[PDB]
Design a protein around this ligand. Sequence first.
Ligand SMILES: CCCCCCCCCC[n+]1ccn(CC(O)(P(=O)([O-])O)P(=O)(O)O)c1
Lengths: 334, 334, 334, 334, 334, 334
Amino acid sequence: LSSSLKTCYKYLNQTSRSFAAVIQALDGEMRNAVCIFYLVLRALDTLEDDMTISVEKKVPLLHNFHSFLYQPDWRFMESKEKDRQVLEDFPTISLEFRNLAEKYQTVIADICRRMGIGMAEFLDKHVTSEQEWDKYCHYVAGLVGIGLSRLFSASEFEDPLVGEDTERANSMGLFLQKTNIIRDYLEDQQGGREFWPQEVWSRYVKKLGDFALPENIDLAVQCLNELITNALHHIPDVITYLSRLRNQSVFNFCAIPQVMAIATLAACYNNQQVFKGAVLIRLGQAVTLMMDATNMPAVKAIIYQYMEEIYHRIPDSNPSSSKTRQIISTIRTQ
Amino acid sequence: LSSSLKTCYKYLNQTSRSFAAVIQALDGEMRNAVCIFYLVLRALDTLEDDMTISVEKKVPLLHNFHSFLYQPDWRFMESKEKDRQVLEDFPTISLEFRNLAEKYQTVIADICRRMGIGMAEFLDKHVTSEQEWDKYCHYVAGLVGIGLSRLFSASEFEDPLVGEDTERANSMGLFLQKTNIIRDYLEDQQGGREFWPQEVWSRYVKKLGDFALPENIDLAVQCLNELITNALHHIPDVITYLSRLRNQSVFNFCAIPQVMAIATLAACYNNQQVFKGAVLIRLGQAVTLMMDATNMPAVKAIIYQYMEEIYHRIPDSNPSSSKTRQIISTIRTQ
Amino acid sequence: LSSSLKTCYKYLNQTSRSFAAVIQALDGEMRNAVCIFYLVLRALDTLEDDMTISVEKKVPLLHNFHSFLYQPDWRFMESKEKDRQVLEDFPTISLEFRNLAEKYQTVIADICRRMGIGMAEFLDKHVTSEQEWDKYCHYVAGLVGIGLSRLFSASEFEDPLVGEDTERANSMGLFLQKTNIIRDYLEDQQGGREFWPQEVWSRYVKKLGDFALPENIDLAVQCLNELITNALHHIPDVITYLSRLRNQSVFNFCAIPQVMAIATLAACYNNQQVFKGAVLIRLGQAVTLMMDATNMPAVKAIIYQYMEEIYHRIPDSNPSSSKTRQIISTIRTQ
Amino acid sequence: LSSSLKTCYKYLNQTSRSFAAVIQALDGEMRNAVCIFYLVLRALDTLEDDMTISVEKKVPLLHNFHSFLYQPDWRFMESKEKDRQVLEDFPTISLEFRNLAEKYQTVIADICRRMGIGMAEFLDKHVTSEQEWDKYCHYVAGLVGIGLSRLFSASEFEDPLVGEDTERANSMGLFLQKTNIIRDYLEDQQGGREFWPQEVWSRYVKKLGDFALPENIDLAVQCLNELITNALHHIPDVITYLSRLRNQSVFNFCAIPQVMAIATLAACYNNQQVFKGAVLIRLGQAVTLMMDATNMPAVKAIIYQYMEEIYHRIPDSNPSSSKTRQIISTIRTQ
Amino acid sequence: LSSSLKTCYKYLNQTSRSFAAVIQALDGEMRNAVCIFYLVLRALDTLEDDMTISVEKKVPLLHNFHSFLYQPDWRFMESKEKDRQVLEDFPTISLEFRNLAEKYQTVIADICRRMGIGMAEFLDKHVTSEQEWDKYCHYVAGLVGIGLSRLFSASEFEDPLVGEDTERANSMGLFLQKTNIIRDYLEDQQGGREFWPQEVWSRYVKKLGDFALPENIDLAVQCLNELITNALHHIPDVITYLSRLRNQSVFNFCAIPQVMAIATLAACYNNQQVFKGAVLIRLGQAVTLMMDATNMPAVKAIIYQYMEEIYHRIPDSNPSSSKTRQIISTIRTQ
Amino acid sequence: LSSSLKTCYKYLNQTSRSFAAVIQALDGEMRNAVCIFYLVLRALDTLEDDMTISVEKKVPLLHNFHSFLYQPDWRFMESKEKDRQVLEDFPTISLEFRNLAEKYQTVIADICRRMGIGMAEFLDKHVTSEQEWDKYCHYVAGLVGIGLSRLFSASEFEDPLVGEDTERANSMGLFLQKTNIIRDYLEDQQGGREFWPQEVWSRYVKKLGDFALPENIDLAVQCLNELITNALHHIPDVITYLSRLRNQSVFNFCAIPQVMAIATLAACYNNQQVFKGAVLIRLGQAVTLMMDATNMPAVKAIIYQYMEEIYHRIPDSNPSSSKTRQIISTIRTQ
Ligand SMILES: CCCCCCCCCC[n+]1ccn(CC(O)(P(=O)([O-])O)P(=O)(O)O)c1
């Protein structure tokens, strides 16, 4: 019916290459709720990304973004990013946001608020310690997981526990984000963006940018393996999280990205290609050509199998080899 | 046990290369029920297609086909079509038809009678209006969806509603027929068969066969896109229909062909190759390699993903661009 | 937590490259139960396989393997087989075996006692009649199926009927073993092993090894087809068995190996390559890209598709063509 | 739909005072199957009864009754027994028999064939040994249990094991028949029918008819208790049988008669009234006012509470005192 | 917790002396939903029943009754009916109504609204045609069923299909009212209320009140029978409605009243005592002493039993006999 | 197969004319575990009740009874109670006790330990406060509830929460014990035993035994009514506890004794017969004539029905009317 809701879905498909379809597949109220949540986070992300907006203007935009959701006429016309249409026509998105049931608005507004604060905080600094890496990921990805989970429970399509266990939801985001950060080393390096924790790579080279130099390829891969080992620690929580889902549409929505992340990590482990270009998320065995990420047992199997793909490739000369075998060993046994 | 039932499945596999496996997977009595229904339909279809049979001779066979089901010895030995074995050894198929529970015989016979009338109606006239295109599609496919739906309900594997909502059942059939007609343009041309609505193609060229001429490709790809736009209007009903199924074997049965159809229209949209030869069904994104057509949310996700693939490519140029986008946008917001 | 248990899962992944993931995906208590049962069966299998162990020393080990499970200190240091470590560190395995709830212990020890006797019975003789082929397969695989089925029922995750139907459970194992025995012909020849039934192959050549000589290739393919035709007879039972399963993790665990087995038999049929190396398992139509092995209907469809793949390749001149079409016909129709 | 099927259910109600409701309450296919099976057996049984048909003419009819199922016009018009309508209009019944799926037809036909043989076999000879008592009951009731079990499995509403375990199915029937035989002692006598095994009652009196003589009322009660004791041996199997049932409608169908029989056996145990008229069905304690035979645990509890009503009233001075306690103790400990 | 909720349950047990216990057995959120829903419906009906209330004063109350649920202070102190307590203390009930989740409020509200209109629409006219009888019934009972079905679905305890199938829900309602009306003939006449359809009783006596004169008793028993025959046509839908339910508490809640109604109709069929006083409900056969109205097969059995209790007594004389036998034969055969 | 286990069950049926049935009806591992537990409790209880056993000799026996379970030869010969046979042949029972899985031995031993201690503590004192009444019941029955609840969980046939929540298991025992204590006032008094709390009965008469005197019948009924009101407070726990059971056999075992208790209190309420003899437990309404204590909803409906029976008989002048109405109102509302 609503032309503004029709427009919101036009942007979802425009700005969401993949997620768009699965989001539209969600049951009842979660559909519109997640669609708007995606769009509002999409806009916020657009502002953050836009480098033609001075820090002076950007900090206040990120900080107050959440309240823009309540100003019927607010819009932004100076963006030069590809997805800026959601900023220039924000009143439409913001208008549908205010149509959602109050309980959903509470969640979305709150996530935007905290996310804006966090993003503004990393506008000047880079990631230093592994602790800061968790904090960054938490702001841009963890909170998303917390928000979605809180939306799932608020709608009652999932148990209240899903939205209460913020640590598990946060792990879903961190895993996705750390995996992407690891995979996009080069693409980011060429974009002047740095995300790998300084306290980790500084143990290998002088500047993060050095991993692109062939003489460093070895060190680059060693660093690579250590970050991937770090990301692997989130698997227990991811499994716990997905095993609590009772709604099929919610499950497809959450499981698919997680499965895709493990496969990526698997494809990246001890792989020099990560520093030459984007890597080949590939095939799988005939025991994964037998299942899709649509039921938990199948997902556990898919995740465990990718675990071993990594375990089979752990070279003894790797500095983290011992730690990698260890965390994987722990994940199996639970 | 019965050797004639075995013969029947032999014919099923011969005539339904792809789909026999899905049919054979149906639970309990739906299995033979649909197998036989498929075979009697194939026979009726062969009689209709056979061009060596004059119209005056053919009409009585179509009108009385439903009754031949009760003539133990009736068989047809003069067809020259590829699937003529089903007409030549029809006594074997009608034998098994007569072994089905009476409540199923009634459904299959009723559909056969009506299909015959309609098939007769169209032996002399070509399809003119879009309204007539629905009628023709109703007779050769829409009725199959209504037939199958009442077998489902009568068998009790599905809710009584499935069989009662004839509009949605009819839509399932209409969506496949139109997709096939659209796809088979060239093959129907070189076979002297015209199915595209006259009131549509007669706005682009003087004679349907003209789209086969390289100098008209552009006008052809336009008419093509107007028909696909037409077809897209059934998706809301296809989704509603599928969302009511509860039996797994019946779900794979109904959902797989609808998904294959949407994928086919996606490939054909704004595609000149439709007029040069056979179109190959395209791969897919990474969020379609994760799921299959076995659960409702996954199928919706799939349908939507193909929706966007078409939407993306809608040239503002096209005379239908506005209507194409509008029907899709509408499918996305329900 | 338990390091000896963590060690068992290390051995599980070490000795089962392709199935550890599925086993680890089993619900609750079945996970450790099946893990241990696998390690225990792996050890026993390794003893039978080792030819550096004389028959007179092996018969006792096989007969009393079941009691070693209760001898905290028993291990075996003379194996020179690839999986010798499960034997060398058996105390860790038996330790975790004695931690399993009694209901599982009883079943596992029971299976080991009978498997041992059966394995020892065949150390001297080669398989003669087809009836003998089933006996051997019953000893090394059918009992396993029977064992697992009793574990499923004991855990309450599967109905008591699963474990009580030993006939069907036994067939699950036979279908799997015959497929592998058939596939590994060459590998077993070069290994000094002869499993193909003599009552059968002796009708084609003078000595089983003759099938390796390029001049007999044709007679080899004939025997190959006779044996494959033989194995197909278990399919009905496999289907019935799987259809009784109600737990997802159990279903996935039971269906995958069978599907893989069908795929294998389909690839080997009338295939010369069986006698010149290993056979490559191929993709398979688009209707198997639409579903996976996680639901009963989908599994039937995959099994039927593969059946047809074999059907279309039956050479009329094959001395078993009739019997092959016959058994495939029955499977299609039931 | 068909008035013939409508007519079949009219007769079902006319001839089955008690069980037409339960049969009509069976899910899907079992309904018509059991309905026809019942009518057919009633017709048969109505011939065996009719003393107005001469041995010479009755014997062949019993022997060939199964064959008339395939003769559209076969009927019988000289019967004078109460239920004669089924024979007079058997064509209606046979028509509906020929309309059931072949798998039900085969089951029913085979049972009638075998039952007709036994019936004829026991027209001349009375029951001699206890071995003969089992034989007689197997032919008139055991087979009914085997047949029904095979129908239940062929319909897939029940597990394959239900139809395969003919011993347990046979017991269901034997228990019901012996129970009734024992209780209808007198009624039998006036009708001149003698069913109590000779080898058992012969060790008490001169002619079975004696027990009716008020003076022998004491010896009659010892024989009564020995038969009841014999029957009791069937309970273990009854429990095993009912324990496999999974369909609620089949369970109600099977459990009830069994429960009503045990209650009967208990009402007749050590009761002199057996020889003075029809003995009635006693209510129960307060632990039976709480349960109904709709779940196995309750049926079990009920059976045990009846095993007790009998156990308590067991006279130490009865010849079978020890054997009765022996069997009841076994039933309790399983 | 709530003291006003406690009061609502005190009112529930007052107005629903028998059924209050079943409503209270409902799972989760349905408990309060149905409890309140029952109370507001009692209130509304109390208003429609009260005759000291002028037509033009009542019509507005019936039409706006639904809006009163949202006015904290609405109550009615001028009703002098027995349940007036729910009208004088409506604020306690409305307060608790306004406490139910909105999804439930919507339904109840919508139902009271449509029901109000309908009731008003009948305050003046009597029931003319049988069709009008369905409208009246649809207005006072049918909507109630539709409402309850939507609550069941909204609560997610029942499948969405339960709520969607409004026609079956309507019948559940109609079978109940038509039964009550038919049996309350006398009581209603002494109260100057007429509900039997005139187009039906007109064909018997000159004025509905004539059935009170003992001279017309026979014409009365004939009208009675033609009406019960009318009501029975609803049993097929009832059975279908009940068969779809998968929640135990909802089943008990829906089945019990329906079974009771069929017991009442059998008690009233061809019974003169309907015009002398109220008809009592009694025993039943021995196959009912073994089953309760808590499972579908047991409920069918019950229904089928009563179907027979009636058939058994359809006098050849009754002018409806033919039609009474038709519907019962059909109910037995589906 | 064990002759000793065979003797244990003979004793079970001997000592528990009721409970034995539902116990023998328990699934798998719980069957013997409960039979044994019931037997050790009966023995322990047979000592405590033996008045021919001096307090000095008794205390030791009670404190060390749990230790006799591990002493193969222990047996008491000087008992004069009816069940003395279980103490004299204790080795039999102690042997079977030792034959149980450790996890079951642990529960039964700990409970027998905690019980001997309490029974000894009350050997000389009487029940003063209502607090002490809860304590006395906790020792003789509450713990039995906690015992059973833990066996259920250990055996895993029930959720771990069942043995966890010791409070609800305690309430299950208190309810039965109090109901019994209340019903057995006279029989107890005549046997010189007193269990009613002094703090309660002292407010009516100078001595508990006085309620036995006709002149005190009214005072007796009032105190009776106050105690019944006390017991009614355990019903919410009784419901919560029953609502968590998933195993049918366990549910039957637990619900029936509870429903029997509720039925008994309802029949005892405001009833003079309590003090003149034992009370005969009447059936109920027709909507109890429609269910059985085998499913939660039914059980709830039954519990609630009886609550209303009590509610309707409450005398206004009764000193506990307010308290009784209060609690009934609460049970209704939860
Ligand atoms: C909002 C849900 C409405 C459920 C309505 C169906 C409840 C079934 C019983 C309805 N009702 C009407 C009359 N009565 C019967 C009685 O007159 P009542 O005193 O009202 O229980 P009784 O059975 O003679 O005690 C009960």
